[PDB]
Amino acid sequence: RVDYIVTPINAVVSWARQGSFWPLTFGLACCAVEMMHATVSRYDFDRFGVIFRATPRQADLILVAGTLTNKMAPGLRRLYEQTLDPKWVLSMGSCANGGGYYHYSYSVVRGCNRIIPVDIYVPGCPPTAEALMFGVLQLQKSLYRQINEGEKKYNKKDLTY
Amino acid sequence: MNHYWGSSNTIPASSTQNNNYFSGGGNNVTIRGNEIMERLPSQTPSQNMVQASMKTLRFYRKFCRLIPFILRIHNIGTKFTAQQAMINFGNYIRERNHYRDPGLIDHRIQLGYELLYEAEMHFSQHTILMQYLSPYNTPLSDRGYSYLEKVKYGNKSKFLQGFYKGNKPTEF
Amino acid sequence: SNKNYTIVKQSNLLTMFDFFKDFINFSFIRKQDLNNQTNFNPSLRSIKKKY
Amino acid sequence: KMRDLGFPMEGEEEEYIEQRVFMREQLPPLESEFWKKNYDPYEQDLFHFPDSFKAYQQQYKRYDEAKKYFEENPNVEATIIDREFKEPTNKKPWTRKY
Amino acid sequence: KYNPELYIYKTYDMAADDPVWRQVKLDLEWTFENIAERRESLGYMPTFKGDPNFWQ
Amino acid sequence: VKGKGSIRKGIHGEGFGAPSHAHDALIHQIKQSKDTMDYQNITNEVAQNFANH
Amino acid sequence: LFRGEHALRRYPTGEERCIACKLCQSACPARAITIETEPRPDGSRRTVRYDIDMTKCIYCGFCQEACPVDAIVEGPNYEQTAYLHEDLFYDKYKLLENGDKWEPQIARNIEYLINQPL
Amino acid sequence: MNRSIFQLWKPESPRSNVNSKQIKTMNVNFGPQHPAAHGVLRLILQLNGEIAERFDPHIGLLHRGSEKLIEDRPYLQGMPYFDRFDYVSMMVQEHAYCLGIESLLGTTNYSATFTQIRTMYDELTRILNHLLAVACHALDVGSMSSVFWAFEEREKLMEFYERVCGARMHAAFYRPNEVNLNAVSSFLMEDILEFSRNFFTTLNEMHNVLTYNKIWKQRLINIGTYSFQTCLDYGLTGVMARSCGLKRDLRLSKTETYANYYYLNFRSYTGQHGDCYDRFLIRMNEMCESLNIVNQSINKISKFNNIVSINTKKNILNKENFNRQTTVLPHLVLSYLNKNDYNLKNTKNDYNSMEELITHFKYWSKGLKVESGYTYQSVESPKGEFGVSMLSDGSNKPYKCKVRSPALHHLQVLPKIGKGHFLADLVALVGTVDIVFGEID
Amino acid sequence: MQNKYMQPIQLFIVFEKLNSKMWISKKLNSNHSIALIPSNWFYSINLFLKRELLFSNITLIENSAIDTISYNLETNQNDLDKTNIENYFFKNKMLVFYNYYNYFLKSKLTLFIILNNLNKNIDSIDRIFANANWLERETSEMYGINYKWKIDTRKLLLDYSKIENPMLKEFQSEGTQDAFYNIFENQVVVLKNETVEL
Amino acid sequence: RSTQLKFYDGGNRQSISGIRATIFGATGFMGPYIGAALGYIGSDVIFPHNHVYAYDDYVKELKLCAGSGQSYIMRHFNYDDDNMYDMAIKNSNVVINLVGSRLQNKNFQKAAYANIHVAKKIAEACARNPNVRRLIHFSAAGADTKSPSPDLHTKFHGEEAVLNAFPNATIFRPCTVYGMQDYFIRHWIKERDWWYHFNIVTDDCTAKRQPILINDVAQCVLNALKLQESAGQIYELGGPHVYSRLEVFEMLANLSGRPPKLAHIPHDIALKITQNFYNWEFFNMEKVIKDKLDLIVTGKHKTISDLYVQPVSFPQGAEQFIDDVRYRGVETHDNLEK
Amino acid sequence: WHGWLSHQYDDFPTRTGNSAFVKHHYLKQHTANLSNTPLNHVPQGAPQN
Numbered sequence A: 001r002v003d004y005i006v007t008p009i010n011a012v013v014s015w016a017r018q019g020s021f022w023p024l025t026f027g028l029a030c031c032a033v034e035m036m037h038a039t040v041s042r043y044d045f046d047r048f049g050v051i052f053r054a055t056p057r058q059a060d061l062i063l064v065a066g067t068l069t070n071k072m073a074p075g076l077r078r079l080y081e082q083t084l085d086p087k088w089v090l091s092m093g094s095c096a097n098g099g100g101y102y103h104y105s106y107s108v109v110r111g112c113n114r115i116i117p118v119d120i121y122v123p124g125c126p127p128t129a130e131a132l133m134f135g136v137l138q139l140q141k142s143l144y145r146q147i148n149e150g151e152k153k154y155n156k157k158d159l160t161y
Numbered sequence B: 001m002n003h004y005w006g007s008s009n010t011i012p013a014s015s016t017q018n019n020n021y022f023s024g025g026g027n028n029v030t031i032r033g034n035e036i037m038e039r040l041p042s043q044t045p046s047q048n049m050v051q052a053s054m055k056t057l058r059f060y061r062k063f064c065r066l067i068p069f070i071l072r073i074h075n076i077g078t079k080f081t082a083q084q085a086m087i088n089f090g091n092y093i094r095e096r097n098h099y100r101d102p103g104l105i106d107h108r109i110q111l112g113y114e115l116l117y118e119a120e121m122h123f124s125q126h127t128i129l130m131q132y133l134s135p136y137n138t139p140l141s142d143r144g145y146s147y148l149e150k151v152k153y154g155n156k157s158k159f160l161q162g163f164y165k166g167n168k169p170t171e172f
Numbered sequence C: 001s002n003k004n005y006t007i008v009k010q011s012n013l014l015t016m017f018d019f020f021k022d023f024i025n026f027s028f029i030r031k032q033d034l035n036n037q038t039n040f041n042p043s044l045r046s047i048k049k050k051y
Numbered sequence D: 001k002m003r004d005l006g007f008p009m010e011g012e013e014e015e016y017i018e019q020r021v022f023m024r025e026q027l028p029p030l031e032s033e034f035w036k037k038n039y040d041p042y043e044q045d046l047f048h049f050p051d052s053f054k055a056y057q058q059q060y061k062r063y064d065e066a067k068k069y070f071e072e073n074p075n076v077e078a079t080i081i082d083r084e085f086k087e088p089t090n091k092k093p094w095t096r097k098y
Numbered sequence E: 001k002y003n004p005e006l007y008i009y010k011t012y013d014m015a016a017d018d019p020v021w022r023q024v025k026l027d028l029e030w031t032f033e034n035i036a037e038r039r040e041s042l043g044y045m046p047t048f049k050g051d052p053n054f055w056q
Numbered sequence F: 001v002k003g004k005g006s007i008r009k010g011i012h013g014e015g016f017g018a019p020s021h022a023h024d025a026l027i028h029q030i031k032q033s034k035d036t037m038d039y040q041n042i043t044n045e046v047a048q049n050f051a052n053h
Numbered sequence G: 001l002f003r004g005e006h007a008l009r010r011y012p013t014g015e016e017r018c019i020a021c022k023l024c025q026s027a028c029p030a031r032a033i034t035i036e037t038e039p040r041p042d043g044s045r046r047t048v049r050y051d052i053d054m055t056k057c058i059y060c061g062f063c064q065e066a067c068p069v070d071a072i073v074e075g076p077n078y079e080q081t082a083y084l085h086e087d088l089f090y091d092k093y094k095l096l097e098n099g100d101k102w103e104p105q106i107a108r109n110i111e112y113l114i115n116q117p118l
Numbered sequence H: 001m002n003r004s005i006f007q008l009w010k011p012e013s014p015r016s017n018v019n020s021k022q023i024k025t026m027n028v029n030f031g032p033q034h035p036a037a038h039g040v041l042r043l044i045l046q047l048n049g050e051i052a053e054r055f056d057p058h059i060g061l062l063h064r065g066s067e068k069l070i071e072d073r074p075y076l077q078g079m080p081y082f083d084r085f086d087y088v089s090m091m092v093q094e095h096a097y098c099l100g101i102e103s104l105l106g107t108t109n110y111s112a113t114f115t116q117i118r119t120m121y122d123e124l125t126r127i128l129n130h131l132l133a134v135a136c137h138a139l140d141v142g143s144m145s146s147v148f149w150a151f152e153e154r155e156k157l158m159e160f161y162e163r164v165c166g167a168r169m170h171a172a173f174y175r176p177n178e179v180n181l182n183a184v185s186s187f188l189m190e191d192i193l194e195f196s197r198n199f200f201t202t203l204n205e206m207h208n209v210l211t212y213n214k215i216w217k218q219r220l221i222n223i224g225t226y227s228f229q230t231c232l233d234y235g236l237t238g239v240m241a242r243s244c245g246l247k248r249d250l251r252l253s254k255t256e257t258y259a260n261y262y263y264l265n266f267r268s269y270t271g272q273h274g275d276c277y278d279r280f281l282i283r284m285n286e287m288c289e290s291l292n293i294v295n296q297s298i299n300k301i302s303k304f305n306n307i308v309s310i311n312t313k314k315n316i317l318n319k320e321n322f323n324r325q326t327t328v329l330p331h332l333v334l335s336y337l338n339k340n341d342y343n344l345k346n347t348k349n350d351y352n353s354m355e356e357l358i359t360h361f362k363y364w365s366k367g368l369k370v371e372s373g374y375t376y377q378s379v380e381s382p383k384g385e386f387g388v389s390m391l392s393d394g395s396n397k398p399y400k401c402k403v404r405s406p407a408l409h410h411l412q413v414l415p416k417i418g419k420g421h422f423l424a425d426l427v428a429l430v431g432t433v434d435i436v437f438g439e440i441d
Numbered sequence I: 001m002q003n004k005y006m007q008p009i010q011l012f013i014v015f016e017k018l019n020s021k022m023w024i025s026k027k028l029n030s031n032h033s034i035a036l037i038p039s040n041w042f043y044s045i046n047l048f049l050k051r052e053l054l055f056s057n058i059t060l061i062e063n064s065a066i067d068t069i070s071y072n073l074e075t076n077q078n079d080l081d082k083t084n085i086e087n088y089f090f091k092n093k094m095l096v097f098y099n100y101y102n103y104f105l106k107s108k109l110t111l112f113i114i115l116n117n118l119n120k121n122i123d124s125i126d127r128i129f130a131n132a133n134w135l136e137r138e139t140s141e142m143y144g145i146n147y148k149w150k151i152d153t154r155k156l157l158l159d160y161s162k163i164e165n166p167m168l169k170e171f172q173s174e175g176t177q178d179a180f181y182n183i184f185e186n187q188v189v190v191l192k193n194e195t196v197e198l
Numbered sequence J: 001r002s003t004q005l006k007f008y009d010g011g012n013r014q015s016i017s018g019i020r021a022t023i024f025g026a027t028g029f030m031g032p033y034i035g036a037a038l039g040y041i042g043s044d045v046i047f048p049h050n051h052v053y054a055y056d057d058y059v060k061e062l063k064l065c066a067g068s069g070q071s072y073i074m075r076h077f078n079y080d081d082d083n084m085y086d087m088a089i090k091n092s093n094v095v096i097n098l099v100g101s102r103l104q105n106k107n108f109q110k111a112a113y114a115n116i117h118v119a120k121k122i123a124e125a126c127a128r129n130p131n132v133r134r135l136i137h138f139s140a141a142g143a144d145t146k147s148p149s150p151d152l153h154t155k156f157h158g159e160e161a162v163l164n165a166f167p168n169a170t171i172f173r174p175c176t177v178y179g180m181q182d183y184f185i186r187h188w189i190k191e192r193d194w195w196y197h198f199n200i201v202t203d204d205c206t207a208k209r210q211p212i213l214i215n216d217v218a219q220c221v222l223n224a225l226k227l228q229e230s231a232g233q234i235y236e237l238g239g240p241h242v243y244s245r246l247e248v249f250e251m252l253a254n255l256s257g258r259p260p261k262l263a264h265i266p267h268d269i270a271l272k273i274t275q276n277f278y279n280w281e282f283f284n285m286e287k288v289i290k291d292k293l294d295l296i297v298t299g300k301h302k303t304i305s306d307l308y309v310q311p312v313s314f315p316q317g318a319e320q321f322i323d324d325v326r327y328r329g330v331e332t333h334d335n336l337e338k
Numbered sequence K: 001w002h003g004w005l006s007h008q009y010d011d012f013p014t015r016t017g018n019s020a021f022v023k024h025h026y027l028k029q030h031t032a033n034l035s036n037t038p039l040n041h042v043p044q045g046a047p048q049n
C-alpha cells in the first residue's frame, strides 16, 4: 500500500516545512516592532529556522501584526490569496485579534479573522517578544502534526485505509 | 494645461509618436490619463443654483463617459450594463436633487470627482464601489433572484409585508 | 542634437510664462558631486547656554 | 532666460539646481482673483460668425432656462426611490440561452 | 554667532572628540567603582524574602 | 515691449503674440486659470484629439 | 509589575475577593470587561458573570489598579496563545482557574509590591 | 565642468510634443506591503527612468479614530492612545497628554519633577527612538547588522521600561499630578547608569561603519537638502528643523520648557547643511548627549558626600542603613522639600482612609473633573514638536483633543525634498524623515 | 508670566476695519496669545502674516476645528464671565482654529474663526502656507468644512468610496457600516453595522 | 413532529437568525457557500469533518461562514459512530448533508458507503433528536438504479434510505453546478491550459447539461427552509435552458475568446485506462461515465420554480469567472491600458 | 519556577521545607497551554459547548 511510503515521506515533508518557515515581511502597527525584536539577536528567530521574505510568493506564514482598517482589508485579503499554498495565518496583538483598543471605532475592522482565516492567535497589546516566539513555536508544532492527526482508520493489519 | 484633465495628459499611442506622423492626439476622457493626479483644486465657488446645476450635469457627463472603462477594468460588466449603471447613478443623483445650497453642491461635486478618480485608478474595490451603481429595486444581472416574497405577499401593502417580515430577531 | 529638440521652445516658455506666478509642469534630475561627497568632513555646530 | 531667473550656470553649481528651480515657492494668488464674476473657460466670442460656428458657442438658453426653473422652484421635496423588490424589466440575463 | 563652536568627527571613538563625553565616561566608571567598593566593604546584601505566613 | 520681439502692450495689458496673430484660447485659459480645471471641458481641439486617437 | 494574563484571586479561606463594584469595568479603557452581579443565596455581593474579552483588552493594568480588594490581578503568564478566537473569550471559570493555578507567584509578587510603600 | 542644465531638466510647453511626457510613466504602488514603507503608506509614485516625478500619498491605512475615541472616553482612559500614536516615543506622548491635563487643572507634577523621572525617561525614550530611526535608515540604505546592534540597546531600554512600569512597551506610566514612587528604585538608577556607560560602545560600533564610510557619505550627503525657508514653510521641527540651523529646541526655551531641562547644562546640535548626512549626525549626537542628560538627572538625586570622622578624617558608613548600598536616592529631594505631601502619600491609602477610598472610587469610576478651558501644551519629542490642543467643557471627558504630530508635517515635505531623486534616494528620504504612521493617522 | 510679552496688535493696526478680541492664559505657554479673526478677512490676514517683517519668520504649527454647536458647560456654569472665550462657542455651528509660531518674536499666535453659515465655507490658506494642505484636507473631511481655493480637496485619512464627517458630535464612534468578506462575491464587502454595547 | 422554522433573515452576520445548523460534508466545493448562506444572516453553523490535509484552505475557510462564536469546526469526525452524530446535531434544528462520493473515487464500495451509510446514519440521528426541525439531503440529478455511474447508482439508494429514516427530509437534485471553485468551469480552464491544444473528450458530446449557479443553489436552500411545505419532497435544480456538451464547449469558447478544439479518445479505451489506472481530480472514471449520461431537470419531481428562485442563464452567470482567462488578440490601444 | 526563570525574584520553590510561596488548600496543579486540544477553553453558550 502507498501508506508504507507516504507516512515516512509525510514525516520528512512536515519536518522540512517546519524547519523552513518563512513569514512575510508585513507589519501594520506597534506589533511590528515586537516582530523585529523577535527577529533580532535577543530572541533569534533564525534558531528555529524562520526567515522573513518580502514577496508573498516566497512566504509560508502571514503575520498579521497590527490593526486592520477598512481602507486596508481588501489589501490584506489580496495578500493572503496571493501567498502561495500551503500557508498559515498568525494574528498578533489585540487589534489584529478582535479589534483591540479600537473595537468601538468607525474605521477599524473588528478582527482580521473576518477577512482572513486565522490559524493561530497571539494575545497581547503588544505581545511580548517571548509571547510571539511561543506562538510561532506552537504554530510550528501544530503544523508538523497537521499532516497526520490520526484521521485514517487502521484495519486488522494496522495499515491505514 | 497643468492638470490631470489637461489635453497633454494623454497616454501616447506609440513609443515614438502620438497616434500619427502628421498629428498629435490622445484619449483622456474615456480612460485615465498618463500622469497621476497630484492636486485637485477646489471647484470655483458657484454663486447660483444655475452654476451648481451646471456643475452637477458636467460631473454626471464625465461619469457617464467613464463608466464603460470602469466596468471593464473592475470586471463588473456582467452585474449591470453600462446604461444600467448610468441610470442607477442617475437615481442616486435624483435622490439628492433637492439640494438648494451652492456651497454644499460644490463640496458634493468635489467628493464625486474624487471617488470617480479612485474608481479609475483602482484605489477602491469593485465590491465596495458597486454600491453606487447597484439597482435600487431590480435584481443584479449576474445572480438568480428569489421572488418568494413577492409570490407570498402579492397585492399586499408594504406595511403588511414589513409586519410579516419583522424588524427584530425573535430568539431574544 | 537629439537634446536640442526639447531646448527649442524653453526660451519662449520662460519669456512668456512667469516661472513663479504660473504653475508650469516640468521634470528635473538632481546631481551630486561624488568627489565632494567622498571628501566631505563631518561636523556639527554645538550650542550651549550663554556663559 | 535661465541666468536671468537665477538657475545654476556652472557644473559645480549644478548640484544645487533644486534650490533654484523647484524649492522656491510660488507667489499666492492675489485676493482679487477670488472675486471674478464668472469663472467659465474663455472662448472666442462667435458674434458676427456664421450660425454653424455659433452652434459651438456656450448655450446661454440653457442658463436662462435653468435660472427660470430655479426661480420657480426655490424649494422642493426630497425624492425617494422605492426599494421594494420588482421583477426586472430587462429579463435577458435570466431568459437568454446563447 | 561670531565665535562658532563645532563638533568634529575625527577619531573612532566619538566620545573622545568631546572633552565632556570623556568626563561622562570617567564619572560613570567612578560611580561604579565607588558602589563596588562600598558593597565589598559591607560584605553582604540584605534582600526581601517571601514569607507564606504573610497571607494568614 | 522690451525683450518680447513684436509683442506690444495695450492699454489694459500686454498681448501674448504678435499684432496680427490670432489669440489662443488654451493659452488664455492656462494664464488666467493656471492649474485649475472645474471640469474637463471638451473643446474642438480635445474632440479632434480623441478622434485622431 | 509585569502584566501578563488576567486572573481572579481568592482569600486564604477560599472565599472570592471579587465584590461586584464594577470599578474595574468602568476603568477598562477598551470596554473589555463585562460584569453582571446578583445577590448570592447566603447574601454575599458576588458576581454571576465576569467576562474579559482578551482580544479586545489592552493589557494596560488599569483593572488591577482600580480593584479595591486585589480581586482581578494581571498575573505574569504570557504564553496564552490560542488557536480559536473563542478560546480568548475568558469567562469567570477561566479567570478563577488562572487565579487558582497562579496564586503562588502572584502572591509572592504582591508581597513585595505591598511592602514597597512601607 | 561644463553646464548640464538642459540635460538635467525638461520643461513642458503648451501643446508641444517634444516638451511633454513622451513616455508612459510607471505608476507604482509603493507600499503598503513594502519593506521600505513602514507598512501603512500607499504612495502612488510616478517614476520616469526610476526617478520619482509625482507623489500621491495615501495615509489612511492606519486611521483609527483615536481622537473620536478619546472624546468618547474620560481623560484617564484616553492616555494609552498616546502610547499608540508613536511606537518609539510613547513616554513623550504620555508626557504631553499629562502636561495638557495638568495645565487645564492649573497645577504641576511636583512629584515627577523632583523625582526626575519625566526627564531621564524622556531622554531614554529619545535614545530608543533615535536608535530605531538610525537602524531603519541604515537598513534601507543597505547596511544590515546595525539593526541588530541598535535593537540590543532597545531591548535593554525596554527592560528598564518593564522594570519601572511592568510593560516593556506602551508603558502608560506618566499620569497627571501622580507618580508611582514605589516603582522608582535606586537599583534601577544604577542599572541605567551601567547602560549609559555601555551605550558608548554601541554608538562607536555604529559610528565606525556608518559615519566615515564612503558609500554612506555618497548616499546621504547632498540628498534631501533644504533651506530654513523650507523648514519654515512646511513647519519642519526637531531634527529636520535643526538640520537647517534654525536652532529651535523646545526643551531649552525660556517660555516653553516643561521639565528639569531648563536647569540642566546640556548641548543641542545643528548642521550648516540641510541634508540626510547632517540629520544622521545630529541623531547620533543627540543619542550621545542623552547619556549626559541622564547622568546629570541621576546626579541631581544622589548623595555624594558623607559624614567624616573628626578624629580619623575618614567616612563613617552606616552598616545597617539602606543608604550604604547605593549613592542614588530617588526620594531625596521630594522628601526634603515636600515632607508633608510625602508623608500623606506614604501613610494614607484607600484601605484605611475614607477620603482616600472616595477619591479612588471616583477616580476609577469617572475621571478627575477638569475645569472648562482651552489649552495647547507641547513637548520636544524625538521626531519634533509633539503637541496636544485640548478643549474641556468642565466634565470628566475632553470635549475636543487635537494632536499635532511632527510626523505628518515631516511626511508633507517628502515630495518636495525627493522629487528629482532616484528611488534608492527616496527610500533613504523616507527613513531620514523619521516618520511613524501611528501619530500621522 | 515672568517674561517679556507684547500683544500682536500689528494685525489690527493694519486691518483698521476689524475689532480686536485677544486672550492670554496661564493654561497656555507664557508667549501664547489667542485672537478672534473673521473668516472674510482670514485670507488677507494670512497674506499679511506670511510676508510682514517680524511675522515673516512664521510657521503654521497646527490647524483644526471644533463643533461648537453642542458645546455646554457641564460644571461651574455660573462662574462663566462675559470675557471668557467659551461665550463664542454657544449657538455657532463651527469654530476653525489655526496656530502659528513666530521665531523673531518667540511667540505663539492662535486665530479662531467662527463659521455660522450652514455649508461651512471658508477661504483656504494652503496657497500661502504649504503645510496647511494636508491639515485643511483632514479638517474638511473630518468636520465637513468647505475650504475654498484649496490646492487639493481630495480626502486624507478617510476610506475609499465613502462620504462622512466622523468627528462631528452627531456621528457615533461605532460608525454606520462594517467591512466583512463575502464568499458569494469572493471579496471584501461593506454592509450595515451591528456592534457590542458594554 | 413539527417542521416549522421561525428565523429572522433581515439581519447581518452579527444578528441572531434563529437557525442552528449542522452541515455534514462542508469541505467540498459547495460546502463553504451553503454554510455562508446560513451564516451571513446570523445563524449558528457546525461543520463536522474528517479531512486530509487539515491545513487545507477548504477546511480553513469554513470559519468565515458565520464568524466568531457562531461557526464551529468539529475535527476528527467518526462517520461510523452514532454518538458522534448525536453530538454534532444535538443543538441543531437544521441538518444539511452534502456528504457524497467524490469525483476522484471509482471504488463502488467506497462510493456506496459515502452516499448511503453516512446519509442513513445522519437521517437516523435526526429522527432520534426531536429538536431537528429540518433535514436537507443533497442528491444528484439523474440518480437512478440503472445508472452506469456508481455515484448516481448509490445516490438513489442513499436518498431512498434518507426518506425512509426521516420522512420529513428534503432532497435536492442539482444539475452541474458551476462557480469559481467548481468542477466544471475550473476543470475546463485547467484542462485547456494543461494541454494548450485541445480538450480531451471521450464521447460524441451530445449529452445534455442544465448548469445552475451555486448562488442560485444557496438561494434555493434558503427558500426551502423558508417554505414549510417543501419538507418531504424531492427537488431538481437547474438553469433556465438545457445545453449539450458540445453547446457548452461552444458557449465557453465564445465567451472566453479561446478557439475551441475537442480531441476525441475512444470511449472504450478511455474507460479501460481510467478504470485500470489511479484516479485523481483531473483523471477519473466518473467523468468519463458522466460524459455520456444526461444530467438535466426532469418533470417527475418539483422544480426550482416551486422554490420560487429564478436561476440566471449560463452565458450570463459564467462570464465573470473567465475574465482572467481571455484570449489576447488584436485589441485597441485604449484596451491596452488594463 | 516561572518567576525564578524570568528573574522576577531570586526565591525558588522548595519541596518539603520552608517555602517562600503560599500553599493554599484550593490551589490547582499547573497546566500547559491546552489550546488546540479537547480540554480547551469553551465559552458558555458557544456552539462547541
Ligand SMILES: CCCCCCCCCCCCCCCCCC(=O)OC[C@H](COP(=O)([O-])OCC(O)COP(=O)([O-])OC[C@@H](COC(=O)CCCCCCCCCCCCCCCCC)OC(=O)CCCCCCCCCCCCCCCCC)OC(=O)CCCCCCCCCCCCCCCCC
Residues within 6 Å of the ligand: J190, J191, J194, J195, J282, J283
Ligand atoms: C534513463 C535510462 C536509459 C533509458 C531511457 C529510459 C526512459 C527515459 C525517458 C526520458 C524522458 C522523461 C520525461 C519525463 C520526466 C519526469 C516527468 C514525467 O514522467 O511526467 C510527469 C509530468 C507531470 O506533469 P507536470 O507538468 O510536472 O505537472 C504540473 C502540475 O502538477 C499540474 O498542475 P495543474 O494545476 O495544471 O493540474 C492539472 C492536472 C493535469 O491537467 C488536466 O487537468 C488535464 C489532463 C488530465 C489527464 C492527464 C492524463 C495523462 C496525460 C499524459 C500526457 C503525456 C504527454 C504526451 C501526450 C501526447 C498526446 C498525443 O494535473 C495533473 O494531473 C498533472 C499531470 C499528471 C500526469 C500523470 C501521469 C504521468 C506519468 C505517465 C505519463 C505517460 C505519458 C506517455 C506519453 C507517450 C510516450 C511515448 O509530466 C507529464 O505528465 C508528461 C510526461 C510525458 C513523458 C513521459 C515519459 C515516461 C514514459 C515514456 C513511455 C515509456 C518509456 C519509453 C522509452 C523506453 C526506452 C527503453
Ligand SMILES: CCCCCCCCCCCCCCCCCC(=O)OC[C@H](COP(=O)([O-])OCC[N+](C)(C)C)OC(=O)CCCCCCCCCCCCCCCCC
Residues within 6 Å of the ligand: A001, A002, A005, A006, A009, J106, J107, J110, J276, J277, J278, J279
Ligand atoms: C523517494 C520516494 C519516491 C516514492 C514514489 C512512489 C511512487 C508510487 C508508488 C505506488 C506504490 C503502489 C503499491 C501498491 C498499491 C496497492 C493498492 C492498489 O489497489 O493499487 C492500485 C492503486 C490504487 O488506486 P485506485 O484508485 O485504482 O484504487 C484505490 C484503492 N482501493 C480500490 C483499494 C480503494 O493505484 C495505483 O495505481 C498505485 C498507487 C498510485 C499512488 C499515486 C500517488 C503516489 C504518492 C507518492 C507520495 C510520495 C512522493 C515522494 C516524492 C516527494 C518529493 C518531495
Ligand SMILES: NC(=O)C1=CN([C@@H]2O[C@H](COP(=O)(O)OP(=O)(O)OC[C@H]3O[C@@H](n4cnc5c(N)ncnc54)[C@H](OP(=O)(O)O)[C@@H]3O)[C@@H](O)[C@H]2O)C=CC1
Residues within 6 Å of the ligand: J025, J026, J027, J028, J029, J030, J031, J050, J051, J052, J079, J098, J099, J100, J101, J102, J103, J110, J113, J114, J118, J138, J139, J140, J141, J173, J174, J175, J176, J177, J183
Ligand atoms: N457539480 C456538483 O458540484 C454537484 C454536487 N452534488 C451533490 O452536492 C454535494 C456537494 O457538492 P460538492 O461540494 O461538489 O461535492 P464534493 O465531492 O466536493 O464534497 C463531498 C463531501 O463529502 C466528503 N466525503 C466524500 N467521501 C466521503 C466519505 N466516504 N466519508 C465521509 N465523507 C466523505 C468529502 O470530504 P473529503 O474532503 O474528506 O473527501 C466532501 O466534504 C455532492 O457530494 C454531491 O453529492 C449533486 C450534483 C452536482
Ligand SMILES: Nc1ncnc2c1ncn2[C@@H]1O[C@H](COP(=O)(O)OP(=O)(O)O)[C@@H](O)[C@H]1O
Residues within 6 Å of the ligand: H303, H306, H307, H318, H321, H322, H323, H329, H331, H332, H335, H336
Ligand atoms: N536612606 C536614605 N533614604 C533617603 N534619603 C536619605 C537617606 N539617608 C540620608 N538621606 C538624606 O541624607 C541627608 C542626611 O544626611 P546624613 O546625616 O549623612 O544621612 P543619615 O543620617 O541617614 O546617615 C537627608 O537629606 C536625608 O534625607
Ligand code: SF4
Residues within 6 Å of the ligand: A029, A030, A031, A065, A066, A067, A092, A093, A094, A095, A096, A100, A101, A124, A125, A126, A127, G058, H084
Ligand atoms: S494590539 Fe496594541 S501594540 Fe499591537 S498594534 Fe494594536 S495597539 Fe499596537
Ligand code: SF4
Residues within 6 Å of the ligand: G006, G027, G028, G029, G030, G031, G032, G033, G052, G056, G057, G058, G059, G060, G061, G062, G063, G064, G074
Ligand atoms: S488589562 Fe486593561 S484593557 Fe485588559 S481587561 Fe485589564 S483593564 Fe481592561
Ligand code: SF4
Residues within 6 Å of the ligand: G017, G018, G019, G020, G021, G022, G023, G024, G025, G035, G066, G067, G068, G069, G070, G071, G072
Ligand atoms: S475584580 Fe475588583 S474592581 Fe472588578 S468588580 Fe471585582 S472587586 Fe470590583
